[PDB]
């Protein structure tokens, strides 16, 4: 059984007095004319907050339970009015399989003919209770409007995901929607507009007025949303040899670092990132956790051994014996520097010698590092691997462990082509790309077209259709009927009239000409 919530579920969002004013606010409110479940002890979800209302003849509903497991595993909130005393507790309660009333604790407090409305929400650990009591003479909730006032604020710090009602009642859910609230001279809320209910409410909220004058007003921007998601990477089955870089028996000295080229592989960076064996994992042009979504043209691993105190020199914008004479990085360096202590691997050891970006000058001037197992940390050897990343600009070759999907043409999709992402419609192009070009760009520097990494075909990317939305209102003094104009879009994309200005829905077309009242554009009023 379900009922129409009408215009109930509004409450005073705060403790601020406002008078003779229309105030726009966004909070967790019951949506107008929402679908609420009608009950005659089920466990219901709490979601982001609960709208609860009951109708009474003889005080059948006594209280509520809010929490997660509700089975003596953690703390839960018990609110019960037993005869005359309201009792609120947040103990680690053991509840019955079907709790009812007859005829470790952190907080404790003790205090159809009628309608009792409630709002139960939990924000930042504070359980907020709002309510309103009013007499009724009524199978459903009565139609009408009032706002609920705050009574209780419980600093409990408890997660609520489910709740149950202890014994008709109705349960709805609150949503983060915008409302225009009408305050009277005495500071109460006498009316409200649900700004996401329909195009007329949008007009009323946009113009900040319950009564709106005759005319055409722009209230929003309409856009076609994606219906699929396309993951496109070349179907490379070769696992990428990062282990051969990091688990190597022998590392080069810093004056003569070993540059290994990584290509034609699936680069799983979760091993390197999650591993606790590393003393540091620092990325400069990328995040260490985004590495599996991206794809690079090449990855270069510079492998070498340095002294602990000089680990800080393996970075952009640095100076020092290594940064200046042995291993220099670009200031605009893109890549990740990964390093770990090798005191139990390399130390004995004087075989590690030291003195433009990525210049490797091994002409022989050199000194050795005295790496001994008994020295201090700053004097212990560290193994450093620098992974230099070449970002997409040309066809990428080294891609993360993403599972590819099929490509859907002539529909709005959320796409990813070798790390290149966006929303749009993929269609066949008439473009001729050169062998080294994966994608092109428009004047806006946005992607114009792309090459599919699995199939050598070029697709154009057309942005998903959108435009301003204007509501044609005769004036709410005469009528609450409106027509909606979607600017510069097709009626197949959005009693429908297609015109040069856009798609007009709800207005009846008439062949007779008339003097213009509310203009649309392009000769149409």
């Amino acid at each position, epitope marked *: 059984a379900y009922t129409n919530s009408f215009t109930r579920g509004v409450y005073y969002p705060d403790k601020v007095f406002r008078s003779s004013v229309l105030h726009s606010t966004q909070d967790l409110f019951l949506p107008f004319f929402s679908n609420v479940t009608w009950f005659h002890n089920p466990v219901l979800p709490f979601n982001d907050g609960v709208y609860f209302a009951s109708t009474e003849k003889s005080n059948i509903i006594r209280g509520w339970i809010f929490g997660t497991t509700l089975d003596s595993k953690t703390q839960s909130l018990l609110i019960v009015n037993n005869a005359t005393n309201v009792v609120i507790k947040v103990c680690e309660f053991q509840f019955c399989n079907d709790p009812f009333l007859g005829v470790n604790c952190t907080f404790e407090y003790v205090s159809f003919k009628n309608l009792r409305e409630f709002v139960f929400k939990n924000i930042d650990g504070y359980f907020k209770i709002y309510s309103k009591h009013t007499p009724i003479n009524l199978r459903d909730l009565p139609q009408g409007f009032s706002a609920l006032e705050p009574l209780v604020d419980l600093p409990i710090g408890i997660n609520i995901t489910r709740f149950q009602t202890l014994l008709a009642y109705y349960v709805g859910y609150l949503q983060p929607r915008t409302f225009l609230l009408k305050y009277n001279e005495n500071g109460t809320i006498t009316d409200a507009v649900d700004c996401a209910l329909d195009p007329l409410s949008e007009t009323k909220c946009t113009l900040k007025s319950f009564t709106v004058e005759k005319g055409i007003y722009q209230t929003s921007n309409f856009r076609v949303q994606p219906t699929e998601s396309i993951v496109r990477f070349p179907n490379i089955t*070769n*696992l990428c*040899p990062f*282990g*051969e870089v990091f688990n*190597a*028996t022998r590392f080069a000295s810093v004056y003569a670092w070993n540059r290994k080229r990584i290509s034609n592989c699936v680069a799983d960076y979760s091993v390197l990132y999650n591993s606790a064996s590393f003393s540091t994992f620092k990325c400069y042009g990328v995040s260490p956790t985004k590495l599996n979504d991206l794809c690079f043209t090449n990855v270069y691993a510079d492998s070498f051994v340095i002294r602990g105190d000089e680990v800080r020199q393996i970075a952009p914008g640095q100076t020092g014996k290594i940064a200046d004479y042995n291993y220099k990085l670009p200031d605009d360096f893109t890549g990740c520097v990964i390093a770990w202590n090798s005191n139990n691997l390399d130390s004995k050891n004087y075989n590690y010698l030291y003195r433009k970006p990525f210049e490797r000058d091994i002409s022989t001037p050199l000194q050795s590092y005295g790496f001994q197992p008994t020295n201090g940390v700053g004097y212990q050897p560290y193994r450093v691997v620098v992974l230099s990343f070449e970002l997409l600009h040309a066809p990428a070759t080294v891609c993360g462990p993403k599972k590819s999907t099929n490509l859907v043409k002539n529909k709005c999709v959320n796409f990813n082509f070798n790390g290149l992402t966006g929303t749009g419609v993929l269609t066949e192009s008439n473009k001729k790309f050169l062998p080294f070009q994966q994608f092109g760009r428009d004047i806006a520097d946005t992607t114009d077209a792309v090459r599919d990494p699995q199939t050598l075909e070029i697709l154009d990317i057309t942005p998903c259709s959108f435009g301003g939305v204007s509501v044609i209102t005769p004036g709410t003094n005469t009528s609450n009927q409106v027509a909606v104009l979607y600017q510069d879009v097709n009626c197949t994309e959005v009693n429908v009239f297609q015109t040069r200005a856009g798609c007009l829905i709800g207005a009846e077309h008439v062949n007779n000409s008339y003097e213009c009242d509310i203009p649309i554009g392009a000769g149409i009023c």
Partner: antibody
Amino acid sequence: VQLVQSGAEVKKPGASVKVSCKASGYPFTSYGISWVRQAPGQGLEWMGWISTYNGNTNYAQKFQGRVTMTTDTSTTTGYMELRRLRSDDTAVYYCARDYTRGAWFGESLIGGFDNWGQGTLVT
Amino acid sequence: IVLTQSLSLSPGERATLSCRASQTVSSTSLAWYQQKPGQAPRLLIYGASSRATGIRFSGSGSGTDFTLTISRLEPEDFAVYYCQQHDTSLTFGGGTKVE
């Protein structure tokens, strides 16, 4: 991860044997195949190592010019061909996944032979 | 390079196994294996002391003298253990039987 090999065979001196190995549970390209011999009553002898990525193969001096190793990445298998067999070659031939040498670069690694097959006996 | 290995102990006793090299080793290229009768060898220790996944077993050493120890022998430890050196080509020792 599991490695499986062919069953036992008996050969006369001068004959050749082709010992197969198949594997699953991991990407084939990243690990090489190590062949290890163990004659009855003896310890382990390294025979060779082959890259499943580029075909590069290293051999123990004792078998150079006698054994040819190859791989086929489309079936996730490797093969060891032993030519001109002697009675001295009676042994169990083990196929093991090998992470002591890089499949892509050929360099020595810090590791070992973790997952071994059952061993193919050749008389 | 040549490796030489050098056990009668009851369950519950501590075991020490050792191997010597004719030449020094990088250490990180030392591995130990365990071979049960009727079964293929498995990797126990790699990198001189690091424990292989799925493996009381510990390795250590330097230069030309390395060991493998078992803190307490179990009935399942009665296998032949091997010392492997792989920094310069690959070689194994004869193997040590534990009873």
